[PDB]
């Protein structure tokens, strides 16, 4: 579901991802998602407009916008959070990646 | 480069992809792309709004919008076409996938 955050059932580069696909767009067995990376070890000079910082499980995470990809429903694990309150920033980041200024 | 079509240097599910990332968005060593599938064998009931049909090399191809993913510059092969003339349809398909109606 759009803006919901899930874990991967299979080993991957990242441990969490946010579903960003519209709920009215039907793609049987798959969903478009954006992985979340731990913000701790990462650099602060990285654009927050393109890579928003979110807070889940008492920690900060970076939305890896440019790592967007589709995942089969078979790898979608537990739902751990809901990022619908950051819709504005998520929307801005995605549009920026494709259409720029 | 945005809207340019390239071949994959490495074996993949598809043989062509269109770069859809903004030219002003810098992501060292990577680009966001959408694969193109041969339209011949495929079904005609599939939405053209979400999966535009393009013409390259005297054949028809379907833009696999929901198969969007980033690819490292190391796998980008020969540039074979330019789809900038279909910018409107490509833009509409991408926006539809994320924001729906
Ligand atoms: Cl947050
Ligand atoms: Cl065309």
**Nearest residue to A100 (alpha-carbon basis) of B32, B84, A1, A92:** A92
Q: CB B97 to CB A21 under 8 A?
A: yes
Q: Which segments within chain B are labelled E, that is strand?
A: 4-8, 16-19, 30-38, 53-56, 59-63, 69-72, 76-82
B interface with A, Cβ–Cβ < 8 A, is: 20-25, 27, 30, 32, 50, 66-70, 91, 94, 96-101
Resolution of the experimental model, in Å, one decimal: 1.4
Give phi and psi for B86, each to the nearest 5: -110, 20
At residue B37's C-alpha, the angle toward residues B34 and B38, to 5°, is 155
How far does A78 lie from chain B, in Å, by closest CA? 22
Q: Which residues of A touch B28 (CB under 8 A)?
A: none
In the 8-state DSSP scheme, what is residue B41? Answer: S
In the 8-state DSSP scheme, what is residue A36? Answer: E
Helix (H), strand (E) at residue A89 = helix A87-99
Q: Which of B2, B96, B98 should we substitute to test contact with A (largest number of A Cβ atoms within 10 Å)? A: B98
Give phi and psi for A22, each to the nearest 5: -60, 145
Report the C-alpha gap between B48 and B26 in whole angstroms: 30
Q: Which residues of A touch B23 (CB under 8 A)?
A: 100
Q: How many CA within 13 A on the CB side of residue B69?
A: 15
Report the C-alpha gap between A8 and A12 in whole angstroms: 7
Q: CB A98 to CB B50 under 8 A?
A: no
In this structure, which residues have their CB less than 5 angstroms from ion ligand 1?
Answer: A 54-55
B84-91, long-range: CB < 8 A, 24+ apart: B84/B2, B84/B3, B86/B3, B86/B52, B86/B54, B87/B3, B89/B52, B90/B3, B90/B18, B90/B20, B90/B34, B90/B52, B90/B63, B91/A99
**Nearest residue to B74 (alpha-carbon basis) of B14, B31, B16:** B31
Which experiment gave this structure? Answer: X-ray
Residue in chain B nearest A71 by alpha carbon: B67
Q: CB A70 to CB B68 under 8 A?
A: yes
Report the C-alpha gap between B100 and A24 in whole angstroms: 6
CATH class of this structure's domain B1-101: mainly beta
């Amino acid at each position: 579901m759009q803006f919901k955050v899930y874990t991967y059932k299979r080993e991957s580069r990242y441990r969490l991802f946010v579903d960003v696909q519209s709920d009215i767009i039907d793609t049987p067995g798959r969903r478009m998602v954006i992985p979340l990376a731990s913000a701790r070890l990462l650099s602060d000079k990285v654009s927050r407009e393109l890579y928003p910082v979110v807070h889940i499980g008492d920690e900060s995470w970076r939305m890896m916008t440019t790592d967007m990809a589709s995942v089969p429903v078979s790898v979608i694990g537990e739902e751990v959070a809901d990022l619908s309150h950051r819709e504005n920033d998520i929307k801005n980041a995605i549009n920026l990646m494709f259409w720029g200024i």
